[PDB]
Amino acid sequence: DKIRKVLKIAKEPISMETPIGDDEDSHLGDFIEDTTLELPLDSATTESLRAATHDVLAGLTAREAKVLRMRFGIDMNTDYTLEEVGKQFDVTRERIRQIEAKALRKLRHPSRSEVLRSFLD
């Protein structure tokens, strides 16, 4: 079955200058789109989703915002295991997991919910 793999790599790259059609300056390379780019309708929504999560995280109690920003990478390097957070809060372990739930729960039922739901599809 390696025939396929082997048979593939054997093919020599095509001159990107291959004239195609019309003999015109259309050259094979002129048609190769850029895929690492990011569509602006996307780049735009990122700047918005930040502002979104940033607003709704101010809508909670200060510890609910920190705990969620903690539990995820929000405006911070990495994210913290839930044990670390307990030590940071001096109130530890199972307790914290609960707060997370109510926070997600609090953003779930719409007053809060109408804006963040519009981000998916």
């Binding site: 002129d30 190769i32 789109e33 850029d34 602006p40 780049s43």
Partner: protein
Amino acid sequence: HARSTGSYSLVTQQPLGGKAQFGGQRFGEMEVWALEAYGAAYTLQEMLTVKSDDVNGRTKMYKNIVDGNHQMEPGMPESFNVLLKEIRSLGINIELEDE
């Protein structure tokens, strides 16, 4: 055909239809002269920089358009920016002077 924001050519960042959501209309030499006869520079600048060739300016514009601020923070057309490396890839030292 109409296009707002489409795909882009890799080698030069330029509008390119890849989806058959068509690449923009081509603004050629003659059309440029036409803008030069009117005195409209900004129309012309926006045509060949942010509306097209500036990989930065293009997104920076869109974000302002939705924000409702019509401006352009143009930067340098990437086409020319490549010419610069191409000259410099030869033996030529080409620099951008002063301020």
